[PDB]
Amino acid sequence: MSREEVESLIQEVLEVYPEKARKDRNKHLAVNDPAVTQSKKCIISNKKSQPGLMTIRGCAYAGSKGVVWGPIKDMIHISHGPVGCGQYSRAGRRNYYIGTTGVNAFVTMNFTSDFQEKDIVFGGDKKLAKLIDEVETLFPLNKGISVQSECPIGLIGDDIESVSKVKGAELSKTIVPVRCEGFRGVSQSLGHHIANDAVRDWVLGKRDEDTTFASTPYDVAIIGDYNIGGDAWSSRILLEEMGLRCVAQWSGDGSISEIELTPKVKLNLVHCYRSMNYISRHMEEKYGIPWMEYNFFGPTKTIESLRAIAAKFDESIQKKCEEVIAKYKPEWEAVVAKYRPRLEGKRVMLYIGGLRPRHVIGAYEDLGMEVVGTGYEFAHNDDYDRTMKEMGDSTLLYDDVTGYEFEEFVKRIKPDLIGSGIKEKFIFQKMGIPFREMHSWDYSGPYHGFDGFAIFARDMDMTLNNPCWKKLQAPWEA
Amino acid sequence: MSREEVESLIQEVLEVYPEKARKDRNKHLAVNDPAVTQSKKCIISNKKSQPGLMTIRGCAYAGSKGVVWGPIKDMIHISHGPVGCGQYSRAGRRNYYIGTTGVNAFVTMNFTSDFQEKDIVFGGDKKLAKLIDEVETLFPLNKGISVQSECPIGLIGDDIESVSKVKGAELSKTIVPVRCEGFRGVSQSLGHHIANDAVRDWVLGKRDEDTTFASTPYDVAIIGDYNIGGDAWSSRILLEEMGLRCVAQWSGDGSISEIELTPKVKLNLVHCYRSMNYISRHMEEKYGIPWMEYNFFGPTKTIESLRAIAAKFDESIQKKCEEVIAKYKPEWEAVVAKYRPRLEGKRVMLYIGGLRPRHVIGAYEDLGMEVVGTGYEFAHNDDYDRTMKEMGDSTLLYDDVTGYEFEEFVKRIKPDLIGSGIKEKFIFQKMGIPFREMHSWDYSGPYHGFDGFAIFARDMDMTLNNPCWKKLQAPWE
Amino acid sequence: SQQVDKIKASYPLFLDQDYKDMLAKKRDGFEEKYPQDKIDEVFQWTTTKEYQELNFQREALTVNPAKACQPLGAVLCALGFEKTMPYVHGSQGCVAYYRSYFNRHFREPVSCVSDSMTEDAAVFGGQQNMKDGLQNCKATYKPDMIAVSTTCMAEVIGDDLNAFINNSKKEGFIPDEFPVPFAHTPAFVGSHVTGWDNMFEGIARYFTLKSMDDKVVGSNKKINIVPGFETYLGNFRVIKRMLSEMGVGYSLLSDPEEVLDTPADGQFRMYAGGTTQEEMKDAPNALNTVLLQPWHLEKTKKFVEGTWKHEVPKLNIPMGLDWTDEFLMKVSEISGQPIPASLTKERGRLVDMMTDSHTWLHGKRFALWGDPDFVMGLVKFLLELGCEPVHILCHNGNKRWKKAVDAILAASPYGKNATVYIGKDLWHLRSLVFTDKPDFMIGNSYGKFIQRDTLHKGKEFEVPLIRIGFPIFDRHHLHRSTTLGYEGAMQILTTLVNSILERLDEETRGMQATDYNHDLVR
Amino acid sequence: SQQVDKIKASYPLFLDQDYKDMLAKKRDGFEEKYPQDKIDEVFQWTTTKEYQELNFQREALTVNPAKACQPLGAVLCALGFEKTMPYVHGSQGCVAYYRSYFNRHFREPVSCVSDSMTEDAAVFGGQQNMKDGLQNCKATYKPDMIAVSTTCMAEVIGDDLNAFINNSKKEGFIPDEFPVPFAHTPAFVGSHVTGWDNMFEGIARYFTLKSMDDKVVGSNKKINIVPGFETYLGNFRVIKRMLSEMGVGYSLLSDPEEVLDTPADGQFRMYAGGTTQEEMKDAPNALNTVLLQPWHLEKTKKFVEGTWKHEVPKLNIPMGLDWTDEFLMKVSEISGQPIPASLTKERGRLVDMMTDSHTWLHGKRFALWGDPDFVMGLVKFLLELGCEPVHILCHNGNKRWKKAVDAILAASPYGKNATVYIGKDLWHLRSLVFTDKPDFMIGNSYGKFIQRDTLHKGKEFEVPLIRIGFPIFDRHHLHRSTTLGYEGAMQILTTLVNSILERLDEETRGMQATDYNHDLVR
């Protein structure tokens, strides 16, 4: 647990790699130091994955269709390319919504052009135009179409932008072409950015000349909450109890009209900085809308965020902010009273995507737990700047961790609990280490807000103290 | 097989018995002869079973609690004795009813005194009185209680009649003591008679002296239809379409109220002669109500019955009878046109209780099938008289058939279908012989009436012609 | 009316308007029915704590029992022996019921005979019935053994089975050497499981009591296994598979898994498999005897210990993880055989499944009933899964048993809200699931009527039944399942987690109302 | 709000009044949602025959496919070999998806690597990715074999796997003797089952093409079994069990049973079991090769017959009664081993279950989908059960396959109302179950959404889903089931009859409305 022990744990693990991979991975592994606050003197990130080392990363299509565009509930998103990508991502992400699926909402459906070799040879542009017509006949209540490009599209010289402009004009329909081919970038991250640029270019400005929306002083947008298990609903509840008017949610349970109304708000509340800082910056420079980062993981961060947000408005909002804080005080205190004793002192290792590896730390600490290791698949150095502030001294940090690295780190550190993804869950269960999914919430949640904290606490307790963990060694082996 | 082979069959199978059992069983196996209409001159029935021969018969408690009393839906029936009888018979018979179970109806519940050895030693009359009170606290909407005696009650000297009189007077309640102990009689049959006499003695004379119910010349009661799978509802619909007023149903979906109004009707329509001829005879003697037998199995018998029933009334009913027949004609003709080709020529062997072994023959013949053998568990000679008129020449007749006999007869005769009970079903399915349950209807039905004939035909076809029967032989045997 | 190409059975035929009108007229005309408001009021009352209190004051009245009488168990025990005919001395009605009861659970033939005692015998005893019955049975059905029990009439009248059988052989009705073990099985004592104990002890006595002089414990290098009253075919098979996998020599004493699962190949086989007379004769030479269901093998235990001199181990029913572990280690110790890799891997696969499914099982609340050994094993496994067995009912349980289960509950935080009931029936249980509603019931088919009652109060209040136990009459082929060992624990775990997930799907299937949580992946 | 002792997850938390009012305020204020009467109007339209006709005129748009892409099958094939690492040459997003797809179905770790080809490699090829990838993979994860397939980006740009691997060895990145079989697996051709075929033939050729001269057909007296794309652990285990029971020497080529079911014993095992390299090398010495799923093993057959010189038997997938019979009789002929008593008994027990359950299965109507071999075996068995396979969908089926299924349907009265669809998806199937409603669906978890749609029309229109196929994500441990042989036929029959009975119990649970038919015994 001492710095020197972590550093030689790092060196011993990298002894297995060939020369080239050794030197690269050394750059992506660090021990946190309060003397170093810049990250750009400490860890490298957002680089290509070394081949053959079993990265956990996905692709830019995941970051665009899976993450940003897919949740928009009243549009139809075409997975343009062969059949795989759209199928493996069908309904895997629990970006919750209210709608009548197949009629006016389409989130858990898989629309695809199902590329055949003929489409590789001749191109898919003509097929895409026919497909758009077929979507219009069979799904008349769709409010827009997006075209999520899979690997072959760019590779064969297809021009989905022209198709989108031609058919969009013919049908008076918003049709967004997104060049999120999976070979682009190094990870899901570039998919976020491409997706953000597609919103800006083809959707966000549609109402620049309109003035019929009735604004108020308290209009906000939730930016970068994809409503995993209802996360954004359990956040919105608090903001509106505080007197704000949440005009839009990007993009969990989000409608295209919400997107279009966002340039009319007074303040953009950015939860997931990694995936939506791009559009937040755009809206600041163009429409003059300020943005701010917040955190609704656990009562400490939620209280701090509510006050910081209210401080951007007037006395009346600040007073209601304290009314909300006072209302939920007995509730989250009852949660800590029951669950913190059952969790305090336990050590947690996390590995997630671009936000949660830091954003959930305060929630674990609200339950007496300690995060002794964390890392991201695809974060940038500004994420790691924020992570050093949240993570403890001499803790382990890993960027684009390999399957082998994560396994070897766990064996040595022996954390009481691991929080990571589905490709990781079953490895560490077999090792006898309690595991919680920190993408899908293991089909539970919400975890955001005061109501989500109660679920979060309940969930870590039920797994960490489960009777099953005592049973892995047979009584006759010993 | 024609006569001389069947007689040889009977002697061959009885070769295995010891001498005493053989001489007895010889008298319960006969070949139909159109020139002898009197069963007392060709088969004996309603005698004790031979020990150890695996009879299919039940006991008098089955006949009373299971058949007659249990279906009465708004009374609570007490299995008075140890826990078995009430449990094995809990909801095993599909005597259907409309009610709210545990509130105002109680058919599929098992109420019991759950005798312990202390109740054998000291008697169970005190327990039974405490039980009645507990029933009254927890089931206040019950309209009466019956006490169905299991074997120990009479053996130990209990007096449930006095308890029924004392508690009945105390609580202003109908409480019916029934001495249907299973050691009584030789079969379910005596249970029927015991239950009939209990209805008569303890229920039926209560509105003799009440006349305010508004009678009509077309009031009838359905006697001896226990509404298996809805059978009596599919019969009632036709009688009332013909213009009659079915005042009571004995005892399928039956209320105690209906039973108490039956002395006010003008005609008792007896379906199950065996189980309720007794109370029918009593109601003709004391109230002057005529009774008549009828048969609602299959179009031919149903049509004959409606006409016969209608002839007991005036022209207006006889006109409506013909309207019902004309209405259902296209329906049962379509059932015949679809299913008779799929079943014609197939030979059926039956073994059931006290009515259906003869009552269903006409429906099988309406689909071109031939009943080549039949028998009863507990029929009397008058039942066999009726059977020989409906069975074909040189067909096999068996009374209180043994498991061994039934197996051996089937092996030789090789029917295409067997209809019998749950204790027989899985035996003959393993021998590759299609089997339909003819007590429970194999959880299908109704089979009575025109609506029932369609389900009956569908059922015989689905089983007889099923693909599973051609696959019992492994291609490599 | 019927449409020929879409024929209707009772459901939904009687929902047709003309049948609906007819039934309404019958009700209003002649049934003197209580007003519907009165029915609704009384129903609601029956779901309240005030009604529960009256309910639990019952002393004399039993409603919807969860047990049967002794001879049913004796018949089942007798069926597990080779070419053995079960034979119940007394009234024939009982035998018709025992056969049909087992017919409907196993969906198989069930052979059993009566000697048809009537009111006459209650006067002069049933000796002639025994003599003729044994002769007729042996000649007609050709068993190699007849195992005699009694109905309650024969017990009340006092027939001396031993003397009657002796006289049947003396008078020449059956050969002297023909095995005719017997046991008195009074229905007013204990329950069906007691019948099993009495029958088995009678058969053990018949074949060993007089021949102990030549016996030497351990001389045959086997372990005797006594299964008790067991109605899952997979429970006989899993014990034999595990013991074979370990190389342990064993004798399963009372083994009906063959005669209750004969193939449909064009012939009926009255008898199949079963423990041989010789396995019972040789059983005192085993190393030891293991009782799989000790809480209803008391009399057997005392005989195996007092006469065979075996030191019967203190083992719980091998259900769940801990108690299967304990069964295997004790078997390993007795036999000198190590636990093989195949069973160790199988154990770890069960644990793997526990880890995979723990988040949906945790905290789930259950009402449950059955026989004592079965119930306590299920309570034990539920605690291992992180479930809460809130209502634990054993109608035929006893004080000492309830204390052992209460001890098991106290050793786990998942037992803090549980109560164990003995002597209570399913009408008692109905009250408990209204007043202290659990998430599911685990029980036999009689539970379907409790689920119906709960739904009638409201969908909110419905308690779904999960069918594990005996009898199961309204599903097909669940008697082939397994509840013992790691295999059985695997099957129970799968049934429980998927019952949970099936119901969650039902509650979230509402388009635009609740299907936000209708997840593809759970 | 939350009450601490009864915490609510998303369901039913968001049914609280304050959340309900918040959501209504979000819809009305900012969603510009179509009015409900319009949503209702369009929904009803999507259940129509006129909609179905528009739906089936689609040519360019696919909605809710029932198939995946080739590399998924190549991965599952590769996992069946001892200490083999699946290695997909191309872009890494694919491998994240394949692993997660199998992770969710098996609830197990799934190991697979990418060589992370990006924009750079998309113009100059991924030679360097292969060199570093192979060397990195061998050193970090220590496989005895690396089995290489391709993503669609690598196929478009034309990377020559053979040259790339050969150059990796020439230039010292991996030892020359280290085995690295390969196959091109383009996602825009065929489906996932095609990738399995391609990968297997690639492995088969790697180990046998250049060593045939010493091979003699039948010299090792074994029979090769190639299972194809198989996601039920029970199906690997049943085949091995029956062949072991027959005393038939066999080699199962691609056997992932162990790696997909490792115990949870405190250690992670990246590899377990699997076909050995020796078994592949020796496989041409077998008597013959049996293809269990011949309709997606066409390339394998050509290699087995053209190079090994085996005369692959014309056998349907061993599903149901007839085709298991035919499987066993042909193995008997090839091996000279008689079909043992144990399997003959097992057959007769299945036939017994068929006779016991036939009255509830008869005439029941089913829509069903899956891979070609699985679907046609399910069709076959349903016909043997007296069921009607009304809607038969195989998205990845071909004309020749549909012709064979139509010939199976024509031979049975129970196929009279059946139609086989190829190239159609689950949005097509949705229409069919509205316009020509069956009683149930048999299919994978994607069917859950069709059941949801049908219930929205009305409870009387709901078509319940019976989960059999791949992938099953919303129930736990069904991947442990069996669908092949008599054992799998037994499991399928039990699932079907009890799904029927569960539904009848639901429709007759309403007290004083429909519970006249709520029978205890069915």
Ligand code: ICS
């Ligand atoms: S968008 Fe991102 S990997 Fe910010 S691509 Fe990923 S629903 Fe993760 S750490 Mo899955 S940057 Fe959201 C995420 Fe975080 S899909 Fe979810 S859990 S907060």
Ligand code: CLF
């Ligand atoms: S990096 Fe891979 S393909 Fe590329 S955009 Fe990302 S998921 Fe997709 Fe869909 S079709 Fe299949 S999965 Fe593999 S090969 Fe192509």
Ligand code: CLF
């Ligand atoms: S003829 Fe009920 S089953 Fe058996 S031993 Fe007594 S308790 Fe048990 Fe008829 S009345 Fe009943 S069913 Fe038999 S006993 Fe008599």
Ligand SMILES: [Fe+3]
């Ligand atoms: Fe697992």
